[PDB]
Amino acid sequence: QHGALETLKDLAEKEVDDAARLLGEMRRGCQQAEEQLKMLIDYQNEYRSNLNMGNGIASNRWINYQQFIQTLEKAIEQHRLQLTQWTQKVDLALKSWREKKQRLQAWQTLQDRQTAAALLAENRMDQKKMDEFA
Amino acid sequence: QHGALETLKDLAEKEVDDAARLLGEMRRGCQQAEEQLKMLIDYQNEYRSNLNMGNGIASNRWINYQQFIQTLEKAIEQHRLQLTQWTQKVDLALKSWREKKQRLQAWQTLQDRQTAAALLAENRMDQKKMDEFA
Ligand SMILES: [Hg+2]
Ligand SMILES: [Hg+2]
């Protein structure tokens, strides 16, 4: 039953829908990666703003401080990297959706012309039969 | 609430719908005009194929024949003319719909780019805030 344009338009439409969902997944992922990174940086600042006791007595504190900050910075670097990765994925998913969206419009335009051609053909053949016989 | 594109796209969409209904009215009218013309031509042929009695005695028949055929031909000419008028209206309504359909797609394309720009802006501003502070 399908036709030339319709089958191709249907595929393009599906590609568009697929691309939009992919874009949605990438965006949600990028937003979550940023929230996770954000939480770590806040944890860091609160931990810092807080670092205000003794000398060698609170030496264990200086030590704990150094170890933790290094561990936290490590986490922050990895999450920053992850955000960079999600960001790139969003950019690509967005570009992909845009072009498939443009491909779909192109098939839509062809169909509109087909609707035109068909209506025009019907108009001519339905009266040709009774125009000349006049 | 409306925006630049949306208000314009909404108008274009309405123009498209209006044009499609106009096209529908013109097509239905053209189809009916052709059916009416068709009926008359059949009436004519049946009347003719039928014209097969006397001489001066059936003179009233020759007379009736001439008067009726002339009356029918007159009707046929007017209906042929009406069909010509509907046909031209269909052609124009079709052209109008096509271009408004193309105007709508153009506004659709702009909106798609706006969806892109917005998603991209959101992505950048939501992490700018936590990218540098890193
Ligand atoms: Hg993000
Ligand atoms: Hg017609």
Curated annotation (Swiss-Prot), chains A, B:
Molecular function terms, GO-annotated: cytoskeletal motor activity
Keywords, comma-separated and alphabetical: Bacterial flagellum biogenesis, Bacterial flagellum protein export, Cell membrane, Chemotaxis, Membrane, Protein transport, Transport
Annotated InterPro entries: Flag_assembly_chemotaxis_eff, Flag_FliJ_proteobac, Flagell_FliJ, FliJ
Cell compartment(s), UniProt: Cell membrane
One BP annotation, GO: bacterial-type flagellum-dependent cell motility
Membrane topology term: Peripheral membrane protein
Listed GO CC annotations: bacterial-type flagellum; plasma membrane
Functional note: Flagellar protein that affects chemotactic events.
Family designation: Belongs to the FliJ family.
PANTHER family membership: FLAGELLAR FLIJ PROTEIN
Protein name: Flagellar FliJ protein
